[PDB]
Design a protein around this ligand. Structure first.
Ligand SMILES: Nc1nc2c(ncn2[C@@H]2O[C@H](COP(=O)(O)OP(=O)(O)OP(=O)(O)O)[C@@H](O)[C@H]2O)c(=O)[nH]1
Ligand SMILES: Nc1nc2c(ncn2[C@@H]2O[C@H](COP(=O)(O)OP(=O)(O)OP(=O)(O)O)[C@@H](O)[C@H]2O)c(=O)[nH]1
Ligand SMILES: Nc1nc2c(ncn2[C@@H]2O[C@H](COP(=O)(O)OP(=O)(O)OP(O)(O)=S)[C@@H](O)[C@H]2O)c(=O)[nH]1
Ligand SMILES: Nc1nc2c(ncn2[C@@H]2O[C@H](COP(=O)(O)OP(=O)(O)OP(O)(O)=S)[C@@H](O)[C@H]2O)c(=O)[nH]1
Ligand SMILES: [Mg+2]
Ligand SMILES: [Mg+2]
Lengths: 429, 432, 429, 432
């Protein structure tokens, strides 16, 4: 029961999922052929959430992959695990984005979305009781943004009750991939604040820091960067695919982490992180996981929580561990950091305990954190946004696809109202 | 299944393209006979038998240099309908390139092109290689680029025009062709790339250690630039780049769309050692004012936008390390309204060596496609050269008697000066 | 018992049957020699319906093949299964059609039909209890149309009680084989609405769509196109040649699908359709057959049922399957598509369940659908018809064979009255 | 068991037929001696011994070019009763072809024909190859086609007449023969096909890359057209076509029955590569106005009906793909009353190469047999050429003194102008 339909969008939206479906396949023991060659019995007990059973003891993922060019889709089917997906599900266009939010959401996104909504609606009906959708995309590019937000506008209309969460990638502070990413961010964020129930803001600036400082890798490729994002994604729904002594799910993480239906931008965290030479000397016990999470450098967002305040904190642990050893740590981080949490919400720590660990590591955890630290993130976008808009630079490319200036005002003014809302609860009594 | 044809106009078109299509046939195991012992679907339409042909068009008004192709090494490689010739040349006239000789064969050129787009399905955009100096590169291109916006329009058109030198001008009346060909291509070509000859002579002397280059040595380093842009089509990379993205990240306003290219590293075979060629080493060689290929000191002006392409074994982390250095240097400054002026491109495959070349088999290479306000200083001298020759009404009578009204100069001067003040608006910073 | 006499007419009428008799031979296990080399016992239990037993353990088809030239008949006997037919049955003329309905039905059709009605009447008497006739022809050409409709006018007079159904081929919307096919259609349809009990309108425009989109074939030949039409034809009488848990036949499909004796133009459908690379990942179970049928693109007619309304729906399944899993799907497609079915007929879904599957595939189905969607089909003929008739173009060729203009009026006015009848039941209360 | 004889009249008849019967003997393994080491029952009546003969008739009023056959390579191939000769020629006179020399040997020509239809049983129709220019091709054909409607009538008769050129007229009095021979053949010949010489000279120069063709090179490309029509008889195809179908799909009204032919692709051996020769590629070459074989731009007029024949390895799906493109092009338009103007023909066998020819061994070929209203523009000039010569009463006295009333011109002019207004009715669209 409680099935999930996975959607991808963009070149960044593809390569994360290819790393992500690589991890989920090993968490159950699924070969690169597509059959089953596992060992235990709990691997198959909840297999139906991310898979539909086919005949001949072969299993297929319930995946939907969308891009505006046949290039990135060719790379997925040609690498490892390029045979596991059903070849019908690969939707790909021929026009291409052009790295343009106007072309992604109005001109070419509207023509291809009808070929997507057939495959979306077919996979929703074949499941018994649908739990909700999750989307992996980015905000910088065109196909990840414009084709991405168009689906979320059409998903919520045909399915209002179903939960909807996004593993987007917010662009970094220092380096910047796309010149028109402030226009791409502001137009996409205005859609994310209407049809998404939560958002997992991940920054590549944090990922180059973690793979260099903590993993101690000389030349970290994207396969090492996108490996950690998948471990966070798997760690959210790890209590749904396995039994546990306190079972959480997407809906329990929805209500417990969102106090107000606008404030739904979250930052993740993962633990443990042992390097190659440093793996044997570190004593890997339960309190050692606790002091690794709550610092600044282990967050996957490029903002220190010391500037702001926490609202809600989710903790999803994995492994045979005792509750008292967990509850002692979760109580203790409230007490000495009593300034950093907010006052008018008592007990702002949500605990979730699974049973089965991931592969190799004896135990694990997954951090979800809400904070007012993200107001520096959107203001750094909002300062860069009006700095380009005051000169009307790069404006006619969006305008030439039939887009009015009032769209930019209604996008940007709705952002600063949200920034004021985080400014309100930061200094409330 | 995405394709991109290329047009080569005149003697500037063909001799650059000869080394270019030489380089493409080496990077796909392509014999010159067309045999070979997917990936290469971009620039080649496969025949039924075991033979490949390029998606190329070579056009010239004078049949001299075309016959090098029909007799040389690359002879059985092209469809002979694609080698359109002529009888008489424009002979450094814009009028003969656009009015007299142009209006008699332009229908045959357009007709072969529309056959090419039908057998393609992933038609992205166009490539036109010519010069501002010669009459064929100025006149015949100006008539051609008008027809494309009539015919296709929405397809992104690129040009590697040979911008004339400040001092080493081979032709005499280059201040007459370069102004009039700009007054046509400004409205139709959304993006064009400038490469000067003179700086390449400075690069070939100072870094290649070759005191005597012919046009061949110039044609090699331009051919690396062409392959470095279309590399994301011919190979899969970690972070791709498309030909529609270049007009997005490099056109801040629809008038000013003239960036300039710089290739790095440029080293010889016996100097291929003695340095480690790291990504941080070569990226400082990109923004160095001596190593550019257009004679415009960028410290005079301001960088509006930059687009870097990396190819080979390129660390994704160290690219983030390299750009973090350059945003801190005081000598390089950006324009006030643009905070984030970079476009990063990563592809796995290295640029190979051409046999008998001079560059060595490096593991990594950069093609810098950046746009600056420093190029406007070159325009002011070229417009000042235009006012000198027009004041005495010299060389005008060759242009009047070939289907051109004399008042067209006074109109085309005003739009050029209108472009001249457009750089002056971008140069100042913000108010308050 | 319940034997069937098969008749062919035209070049299109020949090549379908050669593909059709290829399929029926493998459904029982009959060699290209003509003997029996089957394995099981139910293959021979109902063999007498499409065959007459000859001595020496050899079997002959009960076929009648008609064309106006010796060309197409030479191609049938020279290919594979060119020896199975009795050489006496091949009736062929020497004049030729000329692609003319006037020559097909009056001049040369009347001379050859006397040589046909001997062989027709001989094969009718040798069977114990005749069930009815089926005809495969086309409407575009001359021999398929004029020689085709002349038989149906003479069959019904000598045998009124016997059922009479046609696997015709209605010409496509976009491409058009015959310039005078609007004259060929209108004159043939006027005979089909008097002497035929039902009609299976198949369009080649649908067949090029199915073999390209669903089968994923680069160069589909007619042997691949005519293979699917035969699978529909075999799927209609599949409950007559095999026992089943709910036995339908031609007469049960006659009464259940025809509410009014004029409205007898039907569209077929087939399922499943797995491509070569897509055959293993698709889970082939009973509800997967249901959602494949009722869309637009799997119909073999070139008209969307969304424009009109269904009247009756026949479902003929093949294979060891459970009824509850069938009845759940047949109920469910009524409920969510309650607009698309008509109101004043309750329970407009006819179910038929055979036992034995076809070769290779584990289970199968066959769709027969009645709709008001075909009013776009005849009006597209009727608009093209009067557009040629107003200028009297191509008229003297029909006129020169002794044909009056009043024949065209009585043909065309009887068509538009039928179009008004489908217009009536579309918007009834 | 279906057969079709062919008549060849005059020097235009024989020299075209020489390359044609050359081509038929190669596509059935037929040695010129008649020996060979079913399918070929159409154009050959088999003898008792191992020897085959054609169902052919060669007739000419002047015995010059007939003696090429009785001395050349194809010598033992024909029955010498079938090579009917004459003594004196018509010499570009319609009167000597129809009245003087015609009435003395026409009984011998009819008598050999009626022997041919008796040994046949599948007699479909007739083929008559001649020209409008010469007197034998005009006069002797006009007397012959009248006798066939008297004798057979219901058998469909086809003609590949050589329609005279707009400019390259070899003979002088071609405006006199072409009018009078049209006034006879209009009532009897139900369908006739026009092929002009001048456009073939344009095809042989532009696409075959042969600057100097003789009549041989013209006779090859006409011979492909003849074999492409009768291919459905000589071989089984997926979708057959019969010689009675051509008068059905191409005669909208019993006066206007003049379509025109175009063969495609037309490429050389060294240009046989460098293009893939897909069905969509060659079908655009069919409706191209440059590639036709009759000097009439079809964009001036309107296509009434079209009949396409494909032969070789032809995809049935892609033919549906090709026609769906051409019905969308704005430059090609059809007549308002006809929505569905196509007739598709598919056969399995390719057209072979003649040894020492110029076309290469392709895998597919198209013969376009389309009918247009653009041909009426050629008639208006040819009728205007007729009014000029008749106004001065020039060249009339050669015609009066050979059994022809002078008033026959004034009658035959009126029926021609009656045909001229028949195109004008079809040209306008519908009312309301
Ligand atoms: N980069 C490069 N520039 C070249 C080359 N050959 C000539 N040029 C440039 O071409 C310009 C002279 O114009 P041409 O291209 O020769 O003239 P054209 O366009 O062929 O037309 P005509 O005047 O009719 O010959 C100068 O700016 C030269 O620097 C070459 O091989 N490479
Ligand atoms: N296509 C083609 N046309 C030819 C050929 N030879 C002659 N013609 C054409 O034939 C016409 C002249 O007619 P002829 O055939 O020579 O005259 P004729 O019908 O034999 O009549 P007489 O001169 O009285 O014998 C001109 O239009 C020539 O272009 C040939 O080999 N091929
Ligand atoms: N985490 C992560 N981010 C990536 C990766 N590759 C690119 N990105 C980021 O994603 C964005 C580029 O996404 P991309 O999918 O290519 O845009 P698109 O418009 O959807 O695709 P395209 O048309 O422009 S090629 C940039 O912000 C870039 O930094 C990757 O492998 N991992
Ligand atoms: N499904 C199908 N339709 C075909 C096939 N071949 C032809 N057709 C269609 O059938 C019609 C042609 O039928 P045809 O039998 O040749 O006419 P006829 O008059 O009976 O025979 P003919 O004298 O003209 S050769 C056209 O509508 C054509 O599109 C085939 O193999 N399969
Ligand atoms: Mg030149
Ligand atoms: Mg002669």
């Amino acid at each position: 029961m409680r099935e999930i339909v996975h959607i991808q969008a963009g070149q960044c939206g593809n390569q994360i999922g290819a790393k992500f479906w690589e991890v989920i396949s090993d968490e159950h023991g699924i070969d690169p052929t597509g059959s089953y060659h596992g060992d235990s019995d709990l691997q198959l007990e909840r297999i139906n959430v991310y898979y539909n059973e086919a005949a001949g003891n072969k299993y297929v993922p319930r995946a939907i992959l969308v891009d505006l060019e046949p290039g990135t889709m060719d790379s997925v089917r040609s690498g490892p695990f390029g045979q596991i997906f059903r070849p019908d599900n690969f939707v790909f266009g021929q026009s291409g984005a052009g790295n343009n939010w106007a072309k992604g959401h109005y001109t070419e996104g509207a023509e291809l979305v009808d070929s997507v909504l057939d495959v979306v609606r077919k996979e929703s009906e074949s499941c018994d009781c649908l739990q909700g959708f999750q989307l992996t995309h980015s905000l910088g590019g065109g196909t990840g943004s414009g084709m991405g937000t168009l689906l979320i506008s059409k998903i919520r209309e045909e399915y209002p009750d179903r939960i909807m969460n996004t593993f987007s990638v917010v662009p970094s502070p220092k380096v910047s991939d796309t010149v028109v990413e402030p226009y791409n961010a502001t137009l996409s964020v205005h859609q994310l604040v209407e049809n998404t129930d939560e958002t997992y803001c991940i920054d590549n600036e944090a990922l180059y820091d973690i793979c260099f400082r903590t993993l101690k890798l000389t030349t970290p490729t994207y396969g090492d960067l996108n490996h950690l994002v998948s471990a966070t994604m798997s760690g959210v729904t790890t209590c749904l695919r396995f039994p546990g002594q306190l079972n959480a799910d997407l809906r329990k993480l929805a209500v417990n982490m969102v106090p107000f239906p606008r404030l739904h931008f979250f930052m993740p965290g993962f633990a443990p992180l042992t390097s190659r030479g440093s793996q044997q000397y570190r004593a890997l016990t339960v309190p050692e996981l606790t002091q690794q999470m709550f610092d600044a450098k282990n967050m996957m967002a490029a903002c220190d929580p010391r500037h702001g305040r926490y609202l809600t904190v989710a903790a999803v642990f994995r492994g045979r561990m005792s509750m008292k050893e967990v509850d002692e740590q979760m109580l203790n981080v409230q007490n000495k950091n009593s300034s950093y949490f907010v006052e008018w919400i008592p007990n702002n720590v949500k605990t979730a305990v699974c049973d089965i660990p991931p592969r190799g590591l004896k135990m694990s955890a997954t951090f979800i954190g809400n904070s007012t630290a993200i107001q520096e993130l959107f203001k750094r976008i909002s300062e860069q946004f009006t700095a380009m808009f005051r000169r009307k630079a790069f404006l006619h490319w969006y305008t030439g696809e039939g887009m009015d200036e009032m769209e930019f005002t209604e996008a940007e003014s709705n952002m600063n109202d949200l920034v004021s809302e985080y400014q309100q609860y930061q200094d409330a009594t | 299944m995405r394709e991109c044809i290329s047009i080569h106009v005149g003697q500037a078109g063909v001799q650059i393209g000869n080394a270019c299509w030489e380089l493409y046939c080496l990077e796909h195991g392509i014999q010159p006979d067309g045999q070979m012992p997917d990936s290469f679907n971009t620039f080649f339409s496969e025949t039924g038998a075991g033979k490949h042909v390029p998606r190329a068009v070579f056009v010239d008004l004078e049949p001299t240099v075309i016959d090098e192709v029909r007799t040389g090494t690359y002879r059985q490689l092209f469809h002979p309908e694609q080698l359109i010739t002529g009888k008489e040349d424009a002979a450094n006239n814009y009028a003969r390139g656009h009015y007299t000789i142009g209006k008699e064969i332009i229908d045959l050129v357009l007709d072969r092109i529309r056959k090419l787009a039908d057998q393609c399905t992933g038609l992205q955009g166009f490539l036109v290689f010519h010069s501002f100096g010669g009459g064929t590169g100025s006149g015949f291109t100006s008539l051609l680029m008008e027809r494309l916006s009539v015919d296709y329009g929405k397809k992104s058109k690129l040009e590697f025009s040979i911008y004339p030198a400040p001092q080493v001008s081979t032709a005499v009346v280059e201040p007459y062709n370069s102004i009039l060909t700009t007054h046509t291509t400004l409205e139709h070509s959304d993006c064009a790339f400038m490469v000067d000859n003179e700086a390449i002579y400075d690069i070939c002397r100072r870094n290649l250690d070759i005191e005597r280059p012919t046009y061949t040595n110039l044609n090699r380093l331009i051919s690396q630039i062409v392959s470095s842009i279309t590399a994301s089509l011919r190979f899969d990379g970690a972070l791709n780049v498309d030909l529609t993205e270049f007009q997005t990240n490099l056109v801040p306003y629809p008038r000013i769309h003239f960036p300039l290219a710089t290739y790095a590293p440029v080293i010889s075979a016996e100097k291929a050692y003695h340095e480690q060629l790291s990504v941080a080493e070569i990226t400082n060689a990109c923004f160095e004012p001596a190593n550019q290929m257009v004679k415009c000191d960028p410290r005079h002006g301001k960088y509006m936008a930059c687009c870097l392409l990396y190819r080979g074994d390129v660390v994704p982390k160290d690219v983030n390390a390299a750009i973090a250095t350059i945003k801190t240097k005081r000598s390089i400054q950006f324009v006030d309204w643009c905070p984030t002026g970079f476009k990063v491109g990563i592809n796995y495959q290295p640029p190979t060596v051409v046999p008998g070349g001079d560059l060595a088999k490096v593991q990594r290479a950069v093609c810098m496609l950046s746009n600056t306000t420093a190029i406007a200083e070159a325009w002011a001298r070229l417009d000042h050269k235009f006012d000198l020759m027009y004041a005495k009404r010299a060389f005008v009578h060759w242009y009047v008697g070939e289907g051109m009204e004399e008042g067209e100069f006074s109109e085309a001067r005003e739009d050029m000066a209108a472009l001249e003040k457009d750089y002056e608006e971008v140069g100042v910073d913000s108010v308050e």
